[PDB]
Design an enzyme around this catalytic site. Sequence first.
Site, mmCIF file in Angstrom:
data_model
loop_
_atom_site.group_PDB
_atom_site.id
_atom_site.type_symbol
_atom_site.label_atom_id
_atom_site.label_comp_id
_atom_site.label_asym_id
_atom_site.label_seq_id
_atom_site.Cartn_x
_atom_site.Cartn_y
_atom_site.Cartn_z
ATOM 1 N N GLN A 1 22.834 -15.821 8.018
ATOM 2 C CA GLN A 1 23.128 -15.544 9.426
ATOM 3 C C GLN A 1 23.126 -14.044 9.735
ATOM 4 O OE1 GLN A 1 26.919 -16.931 10.961
ATOM 5 N NE2 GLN A 1 26.180 -17.015 13.079
ATOM 6 N N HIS B 1 19.954 -12.115 12.051
ATOM 7 C CA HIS B 1 20.315 -11.579 13.364
ATOM 8 C C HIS B 1 19.872 -10.128 13.606
ATOM 9 C CE1 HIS B 1 22.405 -15.322 13.996
ATOM 10 N NE2 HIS B 1 22.859 -14.923 15.171
ATOM 11 N N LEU C 1 13.161 -22.616 13.681
ATOM 12 C CA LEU C 1 13.250 -23.075 12.294
ATOM 13 C C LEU C 1 14.507 -22.596 11.558
ATOM 14 C CD1 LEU C 1 10.248 -23.250 9.854
ATOM 15 C CD2 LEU C 1 12.295 -22.016 9.096
ATOM 16 N N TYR C 2 14.990 -21.406 11.903
ATOM 17 C CA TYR C 2 16.050 -20.761 11.127
ATOM 18 C C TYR C 2 17.464 -21.133 11.577
ATOM 19 C CZ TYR C 2 15.959 -17.383 7.252
ATOM 20 O OH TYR C 2 15.974 -16.782 6.018
ATOM 21 N N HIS D 1 22.446 -24.352 10.951
ATOM 22 C CA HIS D 1 23.858 -24.626 11.223
ATOM 23 C C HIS D 1 24.487 -25.698 10.318
ATOM 24 C CE1 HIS D 1 22.865 -22.038 14.517
ATOM 25 N NE2 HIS D 1 24.095 -22.079 14.998
ATOM 26 N N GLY E 1 8.173 -22.361 6.870
ATOM 27 C CA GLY E 1 9.062 -21.201 6.855
ATOM 28 C C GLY E 1 8.652 -20.074 5.924
ATOM 29 N N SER F 1 8.535 -15.780 6.638
ATOM 30 C CA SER F 1 9.507 -14.906 5.982
ATOM 31 C C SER F 1 8.872 -13.929 4.992
ATOM 32 C CB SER F 1 10.620 -15.725 5.310
ATOM 33 O OG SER F 1 10.118 -16.534 4.263
HETATM 34 C C1 HEM Z 1 30.226 -21.022 12.127
HETATM 35 C C2 HEM Z 1 29.295 -20.064 12.192
HETATM 36 C C3 HEM Z 1 28.191 -20.103 13.277
HETATM 37 C C4 HEM Z 1 28.385 -20.061 14.603
HETATM 38 C C5 HEM Z 1 29.740 -19.965 15.343
HETATM 39 C C6 HEM Z 1 27.088 -20.122 15.244
HETATM 40 C C7 HEM Z 1 26.840 -20.102 16.598
HETATM 41 C C8 HEM Z 1 25.781 -19.446 17.186
HETATM 42 C C9 HEM Z 1 25.720 -18.943 18.545
HETATM 43 C C10 HEM Z 1 26.851 -19.061 19.597
HETATM 44 C C11 HEM Z 1 24.518 -18.370 18.715
HETATM 45 C C12 HEM Z 1 23.988 -17.690 20.004
HETATM 46 C C13 HEM Z 1 23.381 -18.721 20.956
HETATM 47 C C14 HEM Z 1 22.218 -19.441 20.319
HETATM 48 O O1 HEM Z 1 21.177 -18.791 20.033
HETATM 49 O O2 HEM Z 1 22.332 -20.675 20.097
HETATM 50 C C15 HEM Z 1 23.782 -18.489 17.465
HETATM 51 C C16 HEM Z 1 22.506 -18.030 17.215
HETATM 52 C C17 HEM Z 1 21.793 -18.124 16.035
HETATM 53 N N1 HEM Z 1 22.303 -18.518 14.798
HETATM 54 FE FE1 HEM Z 1 24.197 -19.342 14.519
HETATM 55 N N2 HEM Z 1 26.119 -20.191 14.258
HETATM 56 C C18 HEM Z 1 26.758 -20.188 13.031
HETATM 57 C C19 HEM Z 1 26.116 -20.248 11.808
HETATM 58 C C20 HEM Z 1 24.787 -19.938 11.563
HETATM 59 C C21 HEM Z 1 24.088 -20.023 10.288
HETATM 60 C C22 HEM Z 1 24.693 -20.482 8.942
HETATM 61 C C23 HEM Z 1 22.822 -19.633 10.479
HETATM 62 C C24 HEM Z 1 21.720 -19.571 9.395
HETATM 63 C C25 HEM Z 1 20.993 -18.463 9.228
HETATM 64 C C26 HEM Z 1 22.661 -19.284 11.878
HETATM 65 C C27 HEM Z 1 21.503 -18.838 12.481
HETATM 66 C C28 HEM Z 1 21.321 -18.502 13.807
HETATM 67 C C29 HEM Z 1 20.071 -18.071 14.399
HETATM 68 C C30 HEM Z 1 18.710 -17.903 13.688
HETATM 69 C C31 HEM Z 1 20.384 -17.817 15.882
HETATM 70 C C32 HEM Z 1 19.403 -17.339 16.979
HETATM 71 C C33 HEM Z 1 19.644 -15.861 17.280
HETATM 72 C C34 HEM Z 1 19.367 -15.574 18.734
HETATM 73 O O3 HEM Z 1 18.198 -15.732 19.166
HETATM 74 O O4 HEM Z 1 20.314 -15.183 19.463
HETATM 75 N N3 HEM Z 1 23.878 -19.482 12.505
HETATM 76 N N4 HEM Z 1 24.585 -19.150 16.558
HETATM 77 C C1 LIG Z 2 8.682 -18.645 -2.519
HETATM 78 C C2 LIG Z 2 8.720 -19.945 -1.709
HETATM 79 C C3 LIG Z 2 7.312 -20.440 -1.371
HETATM 80 O O1 LIG Z 2 6.558 -19.734 -0.788
HETATM 81 O O2 LIG Z 2 7.113 -21.608 -1.358
HETATM 82 C C4 LIG Z 2 9.528 -19.821 -0.415
HETATM 83 C C5 LIG Z 2 9.494 -18.535 0.415
HETATM 84 C C6 LIG Z 2 10.191 -18.447 1.530
HETATM 85 C C7 LIG Z 2 11.029 -19.637 2.006
HETATM 86 C C8 LIG Z 2 11.825 -19.520 3.306
HETATM 87 C C9 LIG Z 2 11.655 -20.573 4.407
HETATM 88 C C10 LIG Z 2 12.337 -20.477 5.535
HETATM 89 C C11 LIG Z 2 13.297 -19.308 5.746
HETATM 90 C C12 LIG Z 2 13.446 -18.399 4.799
HETATM 91 C C13 LIG Z 2 12.654 -18.507 3.492
HETATM 92 C C14 LIG Z 2 11.055 -20.751 1.292
HETATM 93 F F1 LIG Z 2 11.800 -21.819 1.705
HETATM 94 C C15 LIG Z 2 10.248 -20.849 -0.005
#
Ligand code: HEM
Ligand SMILES: C[C@H](C(=O)O)c1ccc(-c2ccccc2)c(F)c1
Lengths: 553, 553
Positions: B172, B176, B353-354, B357, B495, B499
């Site tokens: 996370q 971000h 994709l990312y 949650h 993905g 990445s």
């Molecule tokens: C309990 C912890 C977490 C909370 C409270 C939470 C909640 C939120 C909220 C409120 C947003 C902003 C609105 C939205 O884009 O939906 C967000 C965005 C995002 N979160 Fe989480 N989430 C959590 C955990 C995670 C995890 C584990 C990941 C994995 C990487 C993640 C990845 C993302 C991504 C990629 C965005 C989009 C960023 C953007 O465009 O603003 N979050 N999340």
């Molecule tokens: C090394 C391996 C491969 O290319 O297959 C590989 C590389 C990158 C990811 C990856 C996929 C989604 C988000 C972040 C990382 C993944 F899941 C697996």
Amino acid sequence: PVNPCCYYPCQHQGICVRFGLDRYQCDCTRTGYSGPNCTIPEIWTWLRTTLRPSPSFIHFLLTHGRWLWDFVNATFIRDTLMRLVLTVRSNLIPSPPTYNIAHDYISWESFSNVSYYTRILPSVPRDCPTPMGTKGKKQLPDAEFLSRRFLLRRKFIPDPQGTNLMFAFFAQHFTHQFFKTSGKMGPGFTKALGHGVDLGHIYGDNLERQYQLRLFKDGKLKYQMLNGEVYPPSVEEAPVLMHYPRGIPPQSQMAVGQEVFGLLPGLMLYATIWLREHNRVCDLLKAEHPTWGDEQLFQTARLILIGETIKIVIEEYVQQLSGYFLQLKFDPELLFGAQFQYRNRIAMEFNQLYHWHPLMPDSFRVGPQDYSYEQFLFNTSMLVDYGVEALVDAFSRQPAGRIGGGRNIDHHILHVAVDVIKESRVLRLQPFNEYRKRFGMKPYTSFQELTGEKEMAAELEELYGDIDALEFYPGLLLEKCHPNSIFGESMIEMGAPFSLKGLLGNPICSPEYWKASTFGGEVGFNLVKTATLKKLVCLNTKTCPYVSFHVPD
Amino acid sequence: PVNPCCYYPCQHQGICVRFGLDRYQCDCTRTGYSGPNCTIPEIWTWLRTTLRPSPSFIHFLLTHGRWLWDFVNATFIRDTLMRLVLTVRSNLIPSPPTYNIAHDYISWESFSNVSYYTRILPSVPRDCPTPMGTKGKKQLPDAEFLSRRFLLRRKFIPDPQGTNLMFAFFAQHFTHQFFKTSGKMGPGFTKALGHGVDLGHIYGDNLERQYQLRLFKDGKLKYQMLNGEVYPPSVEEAPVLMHYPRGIPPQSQMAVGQEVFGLLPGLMLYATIWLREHNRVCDLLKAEHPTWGDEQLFQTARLILIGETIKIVIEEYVQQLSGYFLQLKFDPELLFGAQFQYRNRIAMEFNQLYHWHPLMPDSFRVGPQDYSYEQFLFNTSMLVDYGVEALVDAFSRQPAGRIGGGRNIDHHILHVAVDVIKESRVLRLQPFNEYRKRFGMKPYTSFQELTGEKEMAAELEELYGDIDALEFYPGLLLEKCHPNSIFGESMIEMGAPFSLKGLLGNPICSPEYWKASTFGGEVGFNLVKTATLKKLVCLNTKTCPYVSFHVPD
Ligand code: HEM
Ligand SMILES: C[C@H](C(=O)O)c1ccc(-c2ccccc2)c(F)c1
Ligand SMILES: *[C@@H]1O[C@H](CO)[C@@H](O[C@@H]2O[C@H](CO)[C@@H](O[C@@H]3O[C@H](CO)[C@@H](O[C@@H]4O[C@H](CO)[C@@H](O[C@H]5O[C@H](CO)[C@@H](O)[C@H](O)[C@@H]5O)[C@H](O)[C@@H]4O)[C@H](O)[C@@H]3O)[C@H](O)[C@H]2NC(C)=O)[C@H](O)[C@H]1NC(C)=O
Ligand code: HEM
Ligand SMILES: *[C@@H]1O[C@H](CO)[C@@H](O[C@@H]2O[C@H](CO)[C@@H](O)[C@H](O)[C@H]2NC(C)=O)[C@H](O)[C@H]1NC(C)=O
Ligand SMILES: *[C@@H]1O[C@H](CO)[C@@H](O[C@H]2O[C@H](CO)[C@@H](O)[C@H](O)[C@H]2NC(C)=O)[C@H](O)[C@H]1NC(C)=O
Ligand SMILES: *[C@H]1O[C@H](CO)[C@@H](O[C@@H]2O[C@H](CO)[C@@H](O)[C@H](O)[C@H]2NC(C)=O)[C@H](O)[C@H]1NC(C)=O
Ligand SMILES: CCCCCCCCO[C@@H]1O[C@H](CO)[C@@H](O)[C@H](O)[C@H]1O
Ligand SMILES: CCCCCCCCO[C@@H]1O[C@H](CO)[C@@H](O)[C@H](O)[C@H]1O
Ligand SMILES: CCCCCCCCO[C@@H]1O[C@H](CO)[C@@H](O)[C@H](O)[C@H]1O
Ligand SMILES: CCCCCCCCO[C@@H]1O[C@H](CO)[C@@H](O)[C@H](O)[C@H]1O
Ligand SMILES: C[C@H](C(=O)O)c1ccc(-c2ccccc2)c(F)c1
């Protein structure tokens, strides 16, 4: 202790890094050399140096023997050499870009902040014994005196290559899209964020300006009908920021991409031509795709015009400039099997290098008439008075001046060259000889060897003190030209790397972009492939006048 | 009239262009295919596709047979395979970038305007019969109901790979910096203009915010001392915009690069660690370069931290996630003999994709305590109470939730998953199976094939009507996982290209940048070459806790 990097000890593109209180180190990584100063050659580099013929010899080969060049141009060898010219020249330019005015080292701000001009060599450190490094006097020669005694045109020296004003006004028009030095940010900063052939001198450097110039119908830009002829719209129709003398009626003012284009009728000439072409292209696209919206009709037309530009710049503009017998070819496919970065950032040295004011004449001949600077400058009626056909004919006939050789800038616009040298010292550019070593040339051992004569060289020795203290822009303009050429070796050997990298660096030249769909089918693709200066004017004008980058003889 | 491009007729990366009234043409250029729809394979492509094993077969090889892999990891085959992984994966990503929310066609605006997220496939045209093209129903399944019945966690499912919360908070935190959707501009736009690993979540997205965080002495960032330990300063000290709940005063806040990081202690944890790291790096650099000013110390430390980030992500973060027996390696030199553009544009698909949650658990355990979501969310003192050492131990011990499979999102943060689906429909994203074909996979013929089970498959077949009508994000999470894996093949195969292109596409991985000098010498260059999650923590703390991307046995 004194700063050791002021001696420029690191050779062949090695990086001088200051370690501790009084020491330094060179980072000779991938320079082809090893040792404390990167002066010890690897097996491959030594195998290339004693087999690499001098830059003058290679110029000689490209400018002599019509018979073999006719053969080469009519074979596969044309492509081989064009690919060789493209790669070898562009590999001198760092990509991604390296330094800027703020940073004489690699940083994230230097990569991301595109508002900077980049630099190939770092600036002369602020703590060096002499302004240029270690050699020369504590005070550099007077900028005004240097321009007066070495750059001021006595008699008109015409270009021996037959270059015309049609080239000169193209040269200025074209370059003013990627040279926009900021007023408020100062020296080293640019308004031209596209950093190359983006055509922001037609569409603008921002969206607010672009939208204001766009008619929003059929992808066209706004225009006005004067005497049955198409011209750029008035500021009343397109409310954009345009630099004009305070007093000129808004009816007489014309709205274009670049803000300074209303100042010269030569600049507003091409601006009118490219505008007419854009809409002409839009008419070819709307027939092909009647379902296309305005935005797609606009953006696709832009890319065609971008493609056309590079086509004409490589195959006609650079062709006349180089005087080469090798028929230059614009083909992005050539670099598809090679390691090439399809990105570009404008360098300040290129900005300094491209000040070709010796091209401008004493007056401007249009038919039986002869217009002076005080009649031609800021003239708003002329373009509409004579028309496109009548002016293009006159600019294609009048000879331009010789850039290199020295003492060839008309007294009117000499103030510009004075500023360039002043700007150079604000930017803290390294000495001429260090840029010679950067671009694979031998440094000049004497002032005699630079100019190729006795008088003007001996005077410079007295003013500079040491040859390794000669400044970037003076050295370029004072250097002896090639046999019957427009400038010296340095202008070619340094300018081409920047130039070709800028042309082929454009994203449209990438494998991803260089497709028929990008330009709206085969029709738009052929528009790029077959574009010519002659075609750009006459397909947009009533009659077809004489149009060329060279004088008719 | 019906739009032919709704039928997605052009296969294998062919570009659909609308000619005339109701006609279409596929631009089969450098796709390896010819014919009306890019289906007739070229001699080499036919050979290449018949010899190519399934992604499922390749997964099996990478995840089985330890004896063979011990040999591979100890030989050059490690470097041979990793280069193939790097080059083959990232080539599936168009560079320079292609489309955005504005243009479903190649354009200059799409290229130059960095405010836009890019996209791999164009949108579903607005004049199609069904919202997903031609297939499916006139009105798509309810976003609220879809997350309730299929994505809502009933019982907690831990990741069989052993992934801990430490990974999930790194995930996370790390994401971000390049995912910052501009809420005011709208979906498809981004504030993260660096488009990758630029560390705009440590040093801010803009220049003025960066300077407010910088202490401007020794290249360090500002910091406050609490309990004798180093922590990020308050908004009173560093007046920057921070998104805190209504009522919380600036003095009670903490200032970092990413505005949303104050909302969670886990996000605020890494912010502290990386800040400690930066200043720690500055200390080593100051010893080696006493002559260096503030600016160079800050800029260089940033690059070193960028290198450290990419090293850890590749050699540990992606290692854990993939669970491959092949020991992954970060060495930009593997690409120095390849056609590779060192630029990246973050895709809107990569954003969708990312949204991992599922990783978040039912509650948060910190030693003897068990904090609920309400207790953990928007917490101000938890970080300062326990310290860095204690919470690193805490998150590294508790298992993170399994991403794929379905029914594993906590109800507190379930509203996110809903918004992602609703954002996708605004973004008019193409069907799941269209992206499958775009990433070298066969489209699913049924929902039963997608899920592996039968109950979820039947109701999805009822709601959607057709498997080719399934959406991108629901399809990614409800897909059957590889035996004992965190998610299914589509999360990897879709993905991985994004990445790896994002990581290696960083300019520091270029031959021009990847030098010792860039990092102030061998000291900084080694820190990048020897970076670890463990070293990132335990070189910035008094004591070393359990630090890993996975739980202990
Ligand atoms: C309990 C912890 C977490 C909370 C409270 C939470 C909640 C939120 C909220 C409120 C947003 C902003 C609105 C939205 O884009 O939906 C967000 C965005 C995002 N979160 Fe989480 N989430 C959590 C955990 C995670 C995890 C584990 C990941 C994995 C990487 C993640 C990845 C993302 C991504 C990629 C965005 C989009 C960023 C953007 O465009 O603003 N979050 N999340
Ligand atoms: C090394 C391996 C491969 O290319 O297959 C590989 C590389 C990158 C990811 C990856 C996929 C989604 C988000 C972040 C990382 C993944 F899941 C697996
Ligand atoms: C990247 O792309 C983004 C586009 O998606 C850019 O953001 C957008 O920027 C535009 C313009 O800067 C904003 O304008 C919006 O577009 C509407 C188009 O219909 C526009 O309506 C018209 O606005 C005209 C002005 O542009 C206006 O003409 C008037 O101009 C002057 C006053 O401004 C006066 O001379 C007269 O009153 C003229 O009449 C005309 O009348 C229309 O009203 C409207 O202004 C909209 O706001 C977008 O809001 C914005 N899109 C966003 C934020 O999503 C972004 O800048 C790009 N990035 C970069 C770095 O360039
Ligand atoms: C007689 C006609 C010309 C006039 C009046 C003119 C005017 C100027 C002036 C005054 C400047 C410097 C601005 C300052 O004062 O700081 C400038 C910059 C420049 N000139 Fe010219 N010039 C002319 C011809 C040309 C030509 C033919 C070229 C050929 C390319 C040229 C190339 C350039 C370039 C590349 C710049 C830098 C652009 C910038 O300011 O960012 N000039 N011009
Ligand atoms: C701008 O240029 C125009 C050319 O169209 C000038 O008009 C000519 O001026 C000459 C004298 O220099 C006259 O002999 C011609 O009869 C004029 N021709 C036309 C068609 O009008 C004009 O004088 C210039 N304007 C300014 C303000 O300098
Ligand atoms: C590397 O470059 C430096 C440039 O300073 C050379 O200069 C050094 O050696 C000279 C001759 O032995 C001394 O007179 C200088 O004092 C000394 N300079 C410094 C800063 O210590 C040096 O010779 C070059 N090294 C090699 C191997 O060629
Ligand atoms: C990048 O270019 C310059 C870097 O100097 C930035 O302009 C400076 O911004 C800082 C902080 O906002 C000010 O203190 C300076 O006064 C500015 N210097 C100027 C205007 O010459 C500029 O903001 C940056 N641009 C972008 C797009 O990030
Ligand atoms: C006119 C003066 C005679 C000098 C001949 C110069 C012709 C350049 O000849 C050059 O010789 C070099 C050896 O010195 C080689 O490394 C080059 O490859 C070779 O072309
Ligand atoms: C007949 C063969 C000559 C044509 C090949 C042209 C080679 C490209 O030109 C080369 O550019 C390099 C980069 O600036 C310079 O270092 C070389 O001296 C120059 O010749
Ligand atoms: C012994 C197994 C290692 C083989 C190296 C292959 C790594 C390349 O990864 C390959 O990428 C392709 C394009 O994204 C996918 O379609 C393949 O399934 C994937 O394995
Ligand atoms: C030489 C490669 C061709 C076989 C690819 C068939 C796709 C089967 O797929 C894979 O088969 C493996 C067989 O060993 C199994 O162990 C994997 O679990 C299975 O997914
Ligand atoms: C093709 C030829 C070559 O590379 O040598 C060549 C290429 C570009 C230039 C050139 C130099 C300065 C400004 C604009 C163009 C030039 F003068 C010669």
